Design a protein around this ligand. Structure first.
Ligand SMILES: [Mg+2]
Lengths: 49, 187, 47, 200, 50, 97, 215, 209
RNA sequence: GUGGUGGAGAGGUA
């Protein structure tokens, strides 16, 4: 599917640093991951007396 | 004595107008709580008066119920009327009159059904509540909070990979692809 | 072919054939209470 | 007080991050004392008025009292004296407690949602006890064994190990350098591989 | 790294030891960020003899 | 078939086959708007059907919280990268754009 | 010590475009490319909708009879509008419509100095009884302005004035026939189409020049 | 619109040639921009003069074994790498050293060339040196085009930078810029920063207005 | 010259 998607086969690409602009020497794994946010927000955790 | 619905409320703002002897038992939003009030509810014990807020609330509720049932009557009555007009030729003699009379009878039956249902719902609404003893009238309010994700909030994927968001750095600092596409999350 | 699936179709990577559909999940609770209630009573309701 | 942790990699070992609101809540009597002293507070009602509205003035005095006041930190399961340590707080905008990554090993505290309890010492005696005996810098070696406990953890170890490798055939191998600064200049220029056999 | 830190503490001192620790963390973080080290499915290598 | 749809209510013209003699088209679904869950989270339902759309029995007319037109959608999916970044993802923390 | 003249811009679409700087010193292009990328992604002045008032609504946690969507979707769609301010910074807009249909940016009233890029941007869908009349005040800002940093019934919105969406760049050599030791910079810029890529480059150049002039 | 435009740059002189500069008020994003840009500027493109060629009399090859001096040829070339020379006369010169202790002052010179430190040591007797010095832009190894040797025409021996939070009472999250410099001594580090700034400015003066 | 929380049960976090 990846090679059908015209994406790099190994699922890894060399990225570019967003501050130095220098490409990282080793290709890194990127992609789309289903990320959740749990009911543990700090707004109800920050107590102070 | 009640906040207008749809009012942004900072911390400590008074919400309910309550009077003691003659001090004030007025309710205030707790500190650290700030949002928008979206709904107010008021309930009164049997034998106690209904405040203008409750009167108005019951007003739009009754209006909504009436309009819903009127529309439900409208759709079915239109279907029946057009079905009858289609059965009859372009505008025998006894059959058409019989069908028109039967349609009128069905329309009257549905009208009386819907009206009786409306009176039943109305009567159900006008009743008081079985509030707790010592409680004359009770009032509750709701608030809406838009919790933006901020550093410290716990985030976890699907494979048992938890995490606490450390910082939120600007878009430039994110690692970007040669095409210029930056990533959002750096695990 | 259902209408809801017609709006978006997931490419299923299942190699195995589906031999029977997943049963209704909440039937475990729902059957118990409704059997305890015996709402529909015959001339002799279920003993 | 308490809150969740957050890794602060820009933190020196002796210092730790601190949310603004926790700082102003905890040190409130100190704020009152300073405000009455310098003169923008005459009555305490006015002092409460400014602290509740948070004028830009209150941040100055808040930073001043925080400046040299050590703060006391501990995790929930404290299994040894390193489980509770003193730090020199740094004000940050947020609700999480920034923590020094090296100290997490002592606390055995990962950032998977751990909450970290904070305390402040009041007496000069207590602050001196914190700074001279409980400061994170003071306790480096484990009391169980002389082995250090403020040790590079996963990521910094990875970086160090990656730096200290050798590639058999890498750009710039075999050429020499007069000084370390020359090596840095060559590498940052990108004309020299990070790990190539060289003379210096 | 642990041995080097322990050795430096007993040799150079404590203030310089913590300075070294902070600098070493800074360098390790920086050059780990420079390194494109990442985990992909191709990294796990199954020997053909298995 | 959907007679009309609004953000709060949905009316369905019931099929003549699956209807009694009288009261033929009656399927009112009042969508539950923003309501409080037991964990103080919002609960609301969204229409996912237009006027005149034919629906079969058991189709999903409107979906509630954490649902994306009939599917279960708990969180969100974003472009992620797996690399140590300035030690901000030091132990398990997350660096956020 | 060559420096680029007569900045060349070519257009892919009314949003996507390419910027090239022919004469550059060797190795210097990557530096400028990163600098321009960061500044462009950081601070371009843009105008986005910050306020929205609908006559029949009180708070955006409600729904309107005849309106296919709740208020929050309306304002979210309204957040994706690409508009331009030619004259003054702050302007107020109006959208009113009654009966069935789909409301786009076309339904908004235009103005002398005010103009909208994405007229095809759907905002909401209306039923037969559907009728909305919404009051919009927009402003031209620079960075992401949340509602918190910014009479009931007036609804605040979070503002992200940045008109740029993605920036990419690459460098190649420039055979100027004088020396092949030169290099040429290709800047791939894709925005919301509201601002001229040449204008963006000139603004970024001025900002960077001022930041350096701090020396 | 308007941004943070600092003026209070400060040079804490940690050494005559090693310096420290800071920039307190700055908008959150430009810290990394300016820091990385200036770092690469100082590394890449500062015109300077350095030796690229030498004639080790009696050492036909690089790894020839020489006598009369305790050290070996690699040490000698590492030494003469370190000299900082400003050439006011030309962009090309070949200098001669002949003596039979070696110091940089032992090299003859004309009114054109100038050596920053003739006190720098190279070797010791118990030495006909013909080395060629040229002007250049940055750090260019001889591999990139005794007869040859690496070069660092840039005058800054070492530059590093780091951005930490900048505290403004009502902004409270900004970037402070911190730069350290180490020039070859041929240039004042603060003057070097000025030179780099003028270079970067003269790059885009065509379009700023 | 004055300042306002017991116990049980259940669940959850580290
Ligand atoms: Mg943990």
């Amino acid at each position: 599917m990846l090679k059908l998607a015209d994406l790099p086969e190994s699922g890894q690409m060399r990225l570019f640093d967003g501050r130095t602009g220098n490409q990282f020497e080793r290709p890194t794994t990127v992609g789309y991951m289903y990320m959740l946010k749990l009911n543990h927000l700090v707004d109800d955790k920050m107590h102070a007396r | 004595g009640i906040v207008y619905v749809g009012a942004e409320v900072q911390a400590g703002d008074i919400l309910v107008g309550k009077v003691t002897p003659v001090k004030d038992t007025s309710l205030r939003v707790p500190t650290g709580t700030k949002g928008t009030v979206i709904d107010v509810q008021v309930f009164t014990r049997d034998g106690v008066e209904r405040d203008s807020r409750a009167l108005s609330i019951e007003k739009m509720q009754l209006d909504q119920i009436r309009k819903d049932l009127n529309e439900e009557f409208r759709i079915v009555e239109g279907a029946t009327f057009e079905r009858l007009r289609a059965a009859l030729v372009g505008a025998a003699d006894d059959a058409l009159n019989e069908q028109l009379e039967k349609a009128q009878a069905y329309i009257s039956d549905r009208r009386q059904l819907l009206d009786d249902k409306f009176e039943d719902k109305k009567r159900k609404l006008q009743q008081g509540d079985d509030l707790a003893p010592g409680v004359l009238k009770i009032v509750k309010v709701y608030l809406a909070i838009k919790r933006r994700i901020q550093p410290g909030d716990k985030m976890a994927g699907r494979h048992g990979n938890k995490g606490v968001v450390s910082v939120i750095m600007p878009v430039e600092d994110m690692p970007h692809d040669a095409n210029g596409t930056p990533v959002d999350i750096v695990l | 072919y259902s209408y809801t699936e017609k709006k978006r179709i997931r490419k299923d990577f299942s190699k195995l054939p589906d031999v029977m559909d997943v049963p209704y999940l909440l039937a475990i609770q729902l059957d118990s209470y409704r059997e305890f209630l015996q709402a529909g009573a015959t001339k002799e309701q279920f003993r | 007080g308490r809150s969740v942790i957050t890794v602060g990699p820009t933190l020196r070992l002796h210092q730790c991050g601190l949310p603004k609101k926790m700082a102003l809540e905890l040190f409130k009597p100190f704020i009152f004392g300073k405000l009455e002293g310098r003169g923008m507070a005459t009555t305490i009602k006015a002092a409460k008025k400014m602290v509740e509205r948070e004028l830009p003035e209150v941040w100055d005095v808040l930073a001043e009292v925080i400046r040299e006041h050590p703060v006391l930190l501990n995790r929930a399961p404290t299994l040894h004296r390193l489980g509770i340590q003193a730090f020199e707080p740094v004000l940050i905008e947020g609700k999480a407690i920034q923590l020094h990554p090296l100290v997490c090993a002592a606390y055995n505290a990962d950032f998977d949602g751990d909450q970290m309890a904070v305390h402040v010492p009041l007496t000069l005696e207590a602050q001196l006890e914190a700074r001279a005996l409980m400061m994170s810098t003071n306790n480096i070696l484990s009391p169980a064994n002389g082995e250090p406990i403020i040790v590079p953890s996963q990521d910094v170890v990875m970086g160090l190990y990656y730096m200290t490798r050798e590639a058999i055939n890498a750009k710039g191998e075999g050429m020499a350098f007069a000084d370390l600064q020359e090596v840095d200049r060559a590498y940052r220029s990108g004309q020299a591989s990070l790990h190539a056999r060289v003379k210096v | 790294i642990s041995k080097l830190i322990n050795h430096c503490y007993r040799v150079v001192g404590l203030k310089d030891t913590v300075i070294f620790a902070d600098q070493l963390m800074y360098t390790g973080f920086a050059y780990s960020t420079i390194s494109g080290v990442s985990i992909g499915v191709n990294d796990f290598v199954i020997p053909d003899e298995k | 078939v959907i007679d009309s749809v609004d953000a709060s209510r949905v009316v369905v013209r019931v099929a003549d086959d699956e209807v009694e003699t009288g009261e033929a088209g009656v399927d009112i679904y009042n969508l539950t708007k923003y309501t409080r869950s037991n964990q103080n989270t919002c609960i609301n339902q969204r229409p996912l059907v237009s006027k005149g759309d034919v629906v079969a029995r058991g189709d999903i007319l409107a979906d509630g919280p954490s649902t994306d037109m009939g599917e279960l959608a708990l969180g969100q999916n974003m472009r992620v990268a797996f690399m140590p970044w300035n030690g901000f993802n030091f132990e398990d923390s997350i660096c956020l754009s | 010590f060559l420096t680029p003249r007569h900045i060349d811009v070519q257009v892919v679409s009314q949003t996507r475009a390419k910027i090239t700087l022919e004469p550059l010193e060797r190795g210097f292009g990557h530096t400028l490319g990163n600098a321009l990328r960061r500044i462009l992604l950081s601070s371009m002045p843009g105008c986005a909708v910050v306020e929205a008032e609908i006559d029949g609504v009180l708070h955006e946690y409600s729904a309107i009879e005849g309106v296919q969507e709740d208020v929050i979707e309306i304002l979210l769609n309204l957040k994706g509008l690409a508009i331009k301010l030619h004259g003054r910074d702050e302007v107020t807009l109006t959208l009113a419509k009654k009966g069935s249909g789909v409301v786009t940016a076309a339904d908004i009233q235009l103005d002398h100095d005010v103009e909208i890029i994405n007229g095809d941007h759907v905002i909401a869908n209306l039923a037969d009884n559907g009728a909305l009349n919404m009051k919009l005040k927009v402003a031209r800002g620079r960075g992401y302005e949340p509602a918190d940093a910014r009479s009931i019934g007036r609804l605040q919105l979070d503002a992200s004035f940045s008109p740029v969406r993605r920036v990419s760049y690459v460098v190649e050599n420039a055979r100027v026939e004088q020396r092949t030791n030169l290099d040429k910079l290709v800047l791939d810029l894709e925005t919301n189409g509201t601002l001229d890529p040449e204008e963006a480059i000139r603004r970024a150049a001025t900002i960077l020049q001022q930041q350096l002039a701090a020396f």
